[PDB]
Design a protein around this ligand. Structure first.
Ligand SMILES: CC(C)(COP(=O)(O)OP(=O)(O)OC[C@H]1O[C@@H](n2cnc3c(N)ncnc32)[C@H](O)[C@@H]1OP(=O)(O)O)[C@@H](O)C(=O)NCCC(=O)NCCS
Ligand SMILES: CC(C)(COP(=O)(O)OP(=O)(O)OC[C@H]1O[C@@H](n2cnc3c(N)ncnc32)[C@H](O)[C@@H]1OP(=O)(O)O)[C@@H](O)C(=O)NCCC(=O)NCCS
Lengths: 313, 313
């Protein structure tokens, strides 16, 4: 009754005094860690600045041991700065604002990467079903617009997640983010395409390409998740045992990627041919052929570059 | 030369030993603060759970002093939990992922709110210029699609920023985020609208409404930034001196908002009337009239609710 409520409230008040002391100490160590953290970041930035000044002096001065020690120094400074907050890029400051997406611990980085891979897998599952209903079951304009809008949203959120990953350590190559922007522009151009003969002569091929891109993204998720888990296992306790599986997966994955690149080039050439028809009143065909060509060129060059990098090392 | 480089490298190595010790201590206090922070969050959650259990017991038990102390307790617990990380919502976990957007210090919250207001102001400036070129200068379909796409992007990023603000303390009412989703859906529906007589009979009115909404957003930014700066000044050292200006700004701002609500209702009624024409082959008019009606209803009810709340207190 009232006595039980009063006794429970007294116990809650004693626990409240304890938790208020705990929170005051928490705020104290939070301010102390913020001050020390800003000091550490400023000192690493000035250390890197003076090291780069010495580097540009020594580059025009000419020994090799100094170069090796400086390269090791720069690599470990990159790791240390990745452990610290790295502020935000241009796109992250534009969209997300002046907020810190840090994920300071390495386990947090792994969890974010795994959740990003699973997010890509689930949106791949959803996109392949919607592309299947658009290409085969239903020939409507409402569902194609819905598919293109979900493609735009998926690529924009993937750009946001990849910028977050870049902000903390991850070596996402700069082409893939621009790939996401160009694919967003492509789906936006396809959204504004009015219904007609030119749209119907390309819609089935575009939806089949989207279906194949999602199917390739399935295997990409499998390879990337396996590689991430193998790096996590090999990192702590559990080199040659990982590379073999990594190269087997890369060799199994490369022909599908190259067929996707050639399909992108084929879509670009098909849109370029369709833009020359007498029954071509839409500017969307010519302004949509260019993103497929750009995607083919950039993706093919980047894939060949990373394959050459993997073979070299 | 080589001797100068060696001496500079030795000095950099001594500073490196210092900064490596500093970083090791930083990692130590980071792990300690993370452990204490998780302990504090768990203890606040269990304290709030037991307090709510006692609250639901005492509500059906019936004293008033207990209710007043419990209300003060819940308010200060909300402030304490807002100082701590509050995880992520459904939308933030969907888009941003499992990353912490915290802004732990109150100054960080103020800086993020001010940057959000300035972002809204700059996008308002850009949107009013593009809407001016679309409504008056150029009657093209490319520029209207660009305006609608920028509207979609602006509303999506505004949804992201508002979810971030909700995640740390800010009392953004839940209607405004859904306002942003419904406006995104409206602009997406307008994107898929094919060119025709029905589109041309509504395009000028919609662009004029967008121009007026941006003009109202200018005054909204002015009022919100002034209110935020007045709360910041009055909060530290520098009640009646703020309320008077706040109510003057609210009284100057309310007729513009109500005219915007009536314009939203007028656009809904105009689209409902246009959907009944014999020359109406587009479903976009009927599926676009509904978001204007929903926006009018929700925005008008929410504005009247917050005005009644401000007048009551
Ligand atoms: C080689 C490839 C298959 C992956 O190999 P890889 O192990 O990731 O090698 P990388 O050098 O690129 O790895 C660097 C980082 O970039 C990331 N990354 C690689 N490819 C990426 C992509 N397409 N998107 C986002 N991130 C990517 C990796 O996860 C990796 O993460 P990390 O920081 O922990 O190291 C890569 O080229 C790829 O993913 N290509 C996809 C191209 C494509 O899909 N084209 C369309 C076909 S229709
Ligand atoms: C009354 C009004 C004008 C602002 O008054 P207010 O001082 O912000 O009062 P609130 O109760 O809403 O403030 C609570 C919080 O919500 C925020 N907020 C208020 N209106 C908001 C909005 N439209 N969008 C995002 N956030 C908003 C405030 O910044 C405030 O921040 P806080 O956490 O620091 O306290 C508000 O109703 C409003 O902004 N309406 C806009 C409606 C509109 O634009 N319709 C379209 C016209 S065409």
């Amino acid at each position: 009754p009232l006595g039980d409520c009063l006794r429970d409230w007294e116990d809650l008040q004693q626990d409240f005094q304890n938790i208020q002391e705990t929170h005051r100490l928490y705020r104290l160590k939070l301010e102390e860690l913020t001050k020390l953290q800003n000091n550490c970041t400023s000192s690493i930035t000035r250390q890197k600045k003076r090291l780069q000044e010495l580097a540009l002096a020594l580059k025009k001065c000419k020994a090799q041991e100094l170069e090796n020690q400086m390269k090791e120094r720069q690599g470990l400074f990159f790791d240390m700065e990745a452990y610290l907050p790295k502020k935000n890029g241009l796109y992250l400051s534009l969209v997300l604002g002046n907020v810190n997406v840090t994920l300071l611990s390495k386990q947090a980085k792994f969890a974010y990467k795994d959740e990003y891979e699973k997010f890509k897998l689930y949106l791949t599952i959803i996109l392949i079903l919607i592309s299947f209903t658009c290409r085969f079951l239903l020939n409507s304009r409402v569902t194609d617009a819905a598919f293109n809008f979900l493609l735009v949203w998926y690529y924009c959120t993937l750009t946001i997640r990849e910028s977050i990953l870049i902000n903390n350590g991850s070596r996402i190559k700069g082409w893939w983010v621009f790939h996401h922007y160009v694919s967003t522009f492509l789906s936006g151009v396809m959204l504004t395409w009015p219904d007609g003969l030119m749209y119907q002569k390309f819609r089935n091929q575009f939806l089949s390409f989207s279906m194949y891109q999602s199917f390739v993204q399935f295997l990409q998720y499998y390879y990337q998740s396996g590689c991430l888990y193998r790096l996590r296992a090999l990192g702590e306790r559990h080199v040659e045992g990982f590379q073999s599986w990594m190269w087997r997966g890369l060799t199994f994955l490369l022909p599908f990627l190259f067929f996707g690149h050639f399909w992108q080039l084929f879509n670009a050439l098909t849109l370029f041919n369709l833009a020359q028809d007498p029954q071509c009143k839409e500017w969307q065909v010519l302004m949509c052929g260019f993103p497929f060509l750009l995607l083919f060129l950039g993706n093919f060059f980047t894939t060949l570059r990373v394959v050459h990098h993997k073979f070299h090392s």
